[PDB]
Amino acid sequence: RLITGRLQSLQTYVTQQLIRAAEIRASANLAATKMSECVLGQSKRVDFC
Amino acid sequence: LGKLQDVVNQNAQALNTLVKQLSSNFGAISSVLNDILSRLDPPEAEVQIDRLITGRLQSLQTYVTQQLIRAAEIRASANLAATKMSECVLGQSKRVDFC
Amino acid sequence: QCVNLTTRTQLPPAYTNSSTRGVYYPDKVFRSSVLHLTQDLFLPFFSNVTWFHAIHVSGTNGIKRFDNPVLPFNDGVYFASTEKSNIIRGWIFGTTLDSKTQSLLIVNNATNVVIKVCEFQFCNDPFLGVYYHRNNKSWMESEFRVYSSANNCTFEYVSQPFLMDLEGKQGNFKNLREFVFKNIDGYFKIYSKHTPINLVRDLPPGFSALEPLVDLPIGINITRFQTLLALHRSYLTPGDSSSGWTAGAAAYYVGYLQPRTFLLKYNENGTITDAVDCSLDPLSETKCTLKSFTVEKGIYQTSNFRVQPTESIVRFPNITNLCPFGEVFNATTFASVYAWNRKRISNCVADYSVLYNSTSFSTFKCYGVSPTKLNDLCFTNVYADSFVVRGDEVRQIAPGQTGKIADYNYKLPDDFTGCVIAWNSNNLDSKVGGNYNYLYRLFRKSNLKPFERDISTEIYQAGSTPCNGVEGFNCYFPLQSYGFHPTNGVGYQPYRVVVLSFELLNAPATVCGPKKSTNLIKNKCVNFNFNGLTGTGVLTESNKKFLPFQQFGRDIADTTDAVRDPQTLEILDITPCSFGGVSVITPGTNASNQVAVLYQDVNCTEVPVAIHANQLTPTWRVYSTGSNVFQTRAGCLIGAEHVNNSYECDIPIGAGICASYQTQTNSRSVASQSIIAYTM
Amino acid sequence: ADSFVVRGDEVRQIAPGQTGKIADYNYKLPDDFTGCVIAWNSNNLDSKVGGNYNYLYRLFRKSNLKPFERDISTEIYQAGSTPCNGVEGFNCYFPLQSYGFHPTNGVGYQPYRVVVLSFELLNAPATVCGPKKSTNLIKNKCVNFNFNGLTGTGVLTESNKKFLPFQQFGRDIADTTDAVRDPQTLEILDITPCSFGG
Amino acid sequence: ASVYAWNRKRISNCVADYSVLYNSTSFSTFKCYGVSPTKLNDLCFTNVY
Ligand SMILES: *[C@@H]1O[C@H](CO)[C@@H](O[C@@H]2O[C@H](CO)[C@@H](O)[C@H](O)[C@H]2NC(C)=O)[C@H](O)[C@H]1NC(C)=O
Ligand SMILES: *[C@@H]1O[C@H](CO)[C@@H](O[C@@H]2O[C@H](CO)[C@@H](O)[C@H](O)[C@H]2NC(C)=O)[C@H](O)[C@H]1NC(C)=O
Ligand SMILES: *[C@@H]1O[C@H](CO)[C@@H](O[C@@H]2O[C@H](CO)[C@@H](O)[C@H](O)[C@H]2NC(C)=O)[C@H](O)[C@H]1NC(C)=O
Ligand SMILES: *[C@@H]1O[C@H](CO)[C@@H](O[C@@H]2O[C@H](CO)[C@@H](O)[C@H](O)[C@H]2NC(C)=O)[C@H](O)[C@H]1NC(C)=O
Ligand SMILES: *[C@@H]1O[C@H](CO)[C@@H](O[C@@H]2O[C@H](CO)[C@@H](O)[C@H](O)[C@H]2NC(C)=O)[C@H](O)[C@H]1NC(C)=O
Ligand SMILES: *[C@@H]1O[C@H](CO)[C@@H](O[C@@H]2O[C@H](CO)[C@@H](O)[C@H](O)[C@H]2NC(C)=O)[C@H](O)[C@H]1NC(C)=O
Ligand SMILES: *[C@@H]1O[C@H](CO)[C@@H](O)[C@H](O)[C@H]1NC(C)=O
Ligand SMILES: *[C@@H]1O[C@H](CO)[C@@H](O)[C@H](O)[C@H]1NC(C)=O
Ligand SMILES: *[C@@H]1O[C@H](CO)[C@@H](O)[C@H](O)[C@H]1NC(C)=O
Ligand SMILES: *[C@@H]1O[C@H](CO)[C@@H](O)[C@H](O)[C@H]1NC(C)=O
Ligand SMILES: *[C@@H]1O[C@H](CO)[C@@H](O)[C@H](O)[C@H]1NC(C)=O
Ligand SMILES: *[C@@H]1O[C@H](CO)[C@@H](O)[C@H](O)[C@H]1NC(C)=O
Ligand SMILES: *[C@@H]1O[C@H](CO)[C@@H](O)[C@H](O)[C@H]1NC(C)=O
Ligand SMILES: *[C@@H]1O[C@H](CO)[C@@H](O)[C@H](O)[C@H]1NC(C)=O
Ligand SMILES: *[C@@H]1O[C@H](CO)[C@@H](O)[C@H](O)[C@H]1NC(C)=O
Ligand SMILES: *[C@@H]1O[C@H](CO)[C@@H](O)[C@H](O)[C@H]1NC(C)=O
Ligand SMILES: *[C@@H]1O[C@H](CO)[C@@H](O)[C@H](O)[C@H]1NC(C)=O
Secondary structure (H helix, E strand, O other), X not given: OHHHHHHHXXXXXXXXXXXXXXXXXXXXXXXXXXXXXXXXXXXOOOOOO | OOHHHHHHHHHHHHXXXXXXXXXXXXXXXXXXXXXXXXXXXHHHXXXXXXXXXXXXXXXHHHHXXXXXXXXXXXXXXXXXXXXXXXXHHOOOOOOOOOO | OOOOXXXXXXXXXXXXXXXXXXXXXXXXXOXXXXXXXXXXEEOOOOEEEEEEOOEOOOOOOOOOOEOXXXXXXXXXXXXXXXXXXOOEEEEEEEOOOOOOOOEEEEEEEEOEEEXXXXXXXXXXXXXXXXXXXXXXXXXXXXOOOOEOOOOOOOOEEEEOOOOOOOOOOOXXXXXXXXXXXXXXXXXXXXXXXXEOOOOOOOOOOOOOEEEEEEEEEOOOOOOEEEEEEEOOOOOOOOOOOOOOOOOOOOOEEEXXXXXXXXXXXXXXXXXXXXXXXXXXXXXXXXXXXXXXXOOOEEEEEOOOOOOOXXXXXXXXXXXXXXXXXXXXXXXXXXXXXHHOEOOEEOOEOOOHXXXXXXXXXXXXXXXXXXXXXXXXXXXXXXXXXXXXEEHHHHHHOOOOOOOHHHHHHOOOOOOOOEEEEEEXXXXXXXXXXXXXXXXXXXXXXXXXXXXXXXXXOOOOOOOOOOOOOOOOOOOOOOEEEOOOOOOOOOOOXXXXXXXXXXXXXXXXXXXXXXXXXXXXXXXXXXEEEEOOEEEEEEEEEOOOOOOOOOOEEEOOOOOEEEEEOOOOOOEEEEEOOOOOOOEEEEEOOOOOXXXXXXXXOOOOOOHHXXXXXXXXXHHHHHXXXXXXXOOOEOEOOOOOEEOOOOOOOOEEOOOOEEEEEEOOOOXXXXXXXXXXXXXX | OOEEEEEOHHHHHOOOOOOOHHHHHHOOOOOOOXXXXXXXXXXXXXXXXXXXXXXXXXXXXXXXXXXXXXXXXXXXXXXXXXXXXXXXXXXXXXXXXXXXXXXXXXXXOOEEEEEEEOXXXXXXXXXXXXXXXXXXXXXXXXXXXXXXXXXEEEEEEEOOOOOOOOOOEEEOOOOOXXXXXXXXXXXXXXXXXXXXXX | OOHHHOOOOOEOOOOOOHHHOOOOOOOXXXXXXXXXXXXXXXXXOOOEO
């Protein structure tokens, strides 16, 4: 019983970590796009930078 | 209306499942807490109650995970919509097929 | 000896509030630096507490009236004392406080406590007299003046006194003493503490943690108790009876424990330093629902901690017909196992207490239904299925058991959901010379299906040679006799077995239990017990349509929500005793204490009906109605005032409306900083 | 200890979730007894010839018992709907009754002596230990320690932890005993996991 | 054999029909572990002692 409960807790933590990693990956992609589009050049997109 | 309707349906559907899944036995003698409490004494009904609690808690965790994934998808869609609003309404876009 | 009490100036005692005192360690488990959440018996915060003056002071022109009432001991008592010169000595506990029932006594006649569990015959108004006066036969006298006699005593315990004594400094009421008495599982637990107070009265709004003192294993029924006074005036009651009530000043406060949920907090030493009553006010409930003593600014969707069921009702069909257990168990003869008699038990009350001074059940193995919960479980179909077997085979009457009896004779099913009763009857159907009447099948070409009976009387084809209907070489008669000589060991004596097969269904009850019925609460939060069916909720009359045989109707997902009363045949409706839509808006604990309440999707007319304000504490009833009755589109917002301004949103509330803690103390002439609810 | 003598057939009624004559009117074992029930036949010790008739038992009671309760009442049972004061009327029986241990009855009536020990494991100094002996004290290696009714694997080390006088062990953040007190020396130890995962 | 020196015997090449031992003795205890008493008539074994 204890093993099943702790394994479920570990699985929940791993799933939360995966979701947070996906969100951070999206944020990092946005940051890289901004870094290569507004620092390495000039952007004509409105309110992008 | 398409996808604008779909998400709403999805949410409603999820909630409906979270109710319709309250009838799952999860291994207990009966998926009714009152029936178990009325039929069995605490020392013997305890195991059935823990079975039901574990099943329902797993159901809640599954619903929360589905809600988190759907919220991530909606967050991506909202970011795209905000970019479209700030780039095609507050100005003119030279990007092909963006708008 | 004892003296009576001709008190005439008695008046209704005053009442006070137990602010935060009465918190004790509700366990023996050590806990260091942890925030635990228990729901044991505790004294609620700001709960009503009765104040007794006991003696009446004779200094104020002379009053000689003694008031020592007998008080109920409902599931725990909190006792507070503010006297100094040992005016309160000890206590007496019991059921009848007579010589017909055992009782408990605690006395502090000197610098050591004495506890007795004798059967004292207490007088009407017990007290304690002589304390200390030299040259009067009163210096160090261990008189009693409390019981006339004491016989058949069980437990005696003499030990160190509870707290410090002497130090008489009149006018201060120093040494506030707090005790909690709890009688659970036979153990009588006393938790004690004392603090050096200096206020005259009206116990300070302070928090006290009561360390455990004693856990006496006395095991007695305690329902009433009384307080022992020290009525000295230099000896007992001087002169004749009475005229001895002068004892200085006396006062004690009595509170009653109720089941409540707390948030006790432990320090590094394992001592409770703070607690939260998860019933008092929305701030406490917000603290409990997230398990922290510090709550920051914002809105919080709390759990349900307000209403607790306090009354239980039972409704069973009005039958009043004792079951013929005597006519079955005390039969002249039982049927043999190979042909077991099946009887339909109906219209009973199934009182097993009748079958006590008739037999001693050697086996009472119940399947699917716990034996303890058999006195409060109405059934719809009962069968007897009685037969007599050999002792060694009594273990073969089981669902998953195999053997001669369980394969050729009975074969109990795998979902029997009944009770197997079996008792020895070597003195009833084991006549001298061998009974030889109870037959049993020994041979069969196959096994038996569950609940099958085979009165075959054929010839067994034991050998590979047909024999027609004669006992050949390998052709035996299938049946055989036991033979109950009244001299065999317990392994061959006749055992009588009755296996009852209950059937719980959505049908009118037929065989109920000995439990009686009570009244019918129709608008409050109760624990109802209808036909073999218990549950917590709020009952209400309804117009639901029910089939003639129907007994209850469920919710969408297997939740019985409309039961039919078995005594009036009227249809009831069960609603949950919980409305979870309450959102608490707080400006942060370290900014203020005022909070706002947002009940979800309800207008400010059903909120006392919705949250059952009549069963809630007065602090919650403050947050039920009042002057701040602002209505929004997501339920109304009692707690905060509504302004016509359009300030920027600070705390989101719902559709459009926001709220904020503003320092309107400068703008308003009298009203100070407050919570406001504008539109975004 | 909680010792008493009952009938052989009724010895099965000394159980947590059991009901019966003793289990409702005499003893009423609790639901978290967490101890050991011992019972042995004694037909050769307190079953004198002619019937002992000394071991009494309650048969009537207006209700059931709370767990671990004792009722020396000696009253008159109101079995009938007619008050009878203190005389054995038509429906007024004496509650207590005698067994009668003739040394000839079957095993279903011979006297059985029952002792129900109720243990209590707490963070308190040990009082009733077992026959197991003590060994030496390893203080810097990886060992399987067995302190007072408490076993576990780890590495012990001297520590400056402050312990309450009655305290026997202290746990980690989440219910993990990490500092035990040696019973033979009263000095404070500290348990570290025998595993460094990095 | 006495309990302190119990005899161990290898049962082999049987069909293990318990129905034979009905009109010889009454088993006061037939408690099985790991294998259900009901499903003993259709369970071939590989080693019996
Ligand atoms: C308090 O009262 C109790 C009885 O109510 C006294 O109990 C005994 O008193 C005698 C003489 O006074 C002593 O010899 C005994 O040792 C006491 N105990 C018992 C168990 O018999 C008691 O002495 C009184 N005074 C105290 C307890 O200080
Ligand atoms: C207390 O109970 C006992 C019996 O349990 C009574 O004392 C005597 O006890 C012996 C056996 O130990 C009996 O043979 C006597 O008949 C009993 N005497 C009686 C009944 O008077 C004692 O009477 C009981 N005390 C009270 C106050 O009822
Ligand atoms: C019910 O009756 C049928 C028919 O008599 C039984 O089936 C026979 O079983 C015997 C022994 O197992 C076989 O030798 C026959 O060949 C079977 N005949 C048929 C037609 O099936 C069946 O065993 C009986 N069931 C019970 C529980 O007694
Ligand atoms: C059983 O009890 C019910 C009440 O629960 C009895 O119903 C009563 O019927 C009489 C005659 O119609 C009314 O005058 C009473 O007012 C009813 N009950 C009450 C107290 O309101 C019923 O008669 C009883 N008898 C049985 C066995 O049905
Ligand atoms: C403890 O004592 C109380 C009071 O004597 C018992 O409550 C009584 O129970 C009887 C039978 O159940 C009722 O007829 C009375 O009306 C009850 N009176 C009160 C004041 O409650 C209670 O049952 C006893 N408990 C135990 C475990 O013996
Ligand atoms: C418990 O018993 C042990 C027995 O060994 C005691 O240990 C001895 O203590 C004495 C006095 O300090 C030493 O001289 C011995 O060398 C010790 N022997 C060993 C190896 O343990 C221990 O002190 C006792 N503890 C208590 C609390 O009584
Ligand atoms: C406590 O109860 C009494 C009635 O017994 C009531 O008069 C009193 O107002 C209550 N508490 C207080 C002090 O309000
Ligand atoms: C008080 O007087 C009554 C008479 O009605 C008597 O029954 C009772 O025992 C007396 N109380 C004491 C303590 O003597
Ligand atoms: C409690 O009683 C005190 C007076 O002793 C009073 O000042 C305080 O407001 C009361 N609190 C409540 C809410 O009961
Ligand atoms: C714990 O107890 C010790 C011993 O008196 C004391 O020094 C310390 O201050 C206490 N700690 C707390 C948090 O009360
Ligand atoms: C049982 O029936 C017999 C028939 O003679 C009767 O004497 C006895 O009182 C009844 N009660 C018992 C002992 O169950
Ligand atoms: C039981 O019944 C017998 C016979 O009527 C009687 O002698 C005995 O006193 C009864 N015992 C009790 C207490 O029921
Ligand atoms: C509350 O805030 C003030 C100001 O920052 C600070 O000094 C005080 O320690 C805080 N107290 C709490 C309860 O956090
Ligand atoms: C209940 O709330 C709605 C919400 O606006 C309101 O229109 C209605 O009048 C309220 N009910 C009553 C009886 O006032
Ligand atoms: C706004 O002003 C109107 C007009 O006096 C008044 O009826 C209403 O209650 C006000 N609302 C507030 C102060 O929130
Ligand atoms: C069972 O065994 C006994 C012992 O010899 C014998 O007398 C009896 O006839 C047997 N019964 C059958 C049905 O074989
Ligand atoms: C045991 O064997 C002997 C001789 O082989 C026989 O007489 C006896 O009846 C047998 N007993 C049983 C129980 O089979």
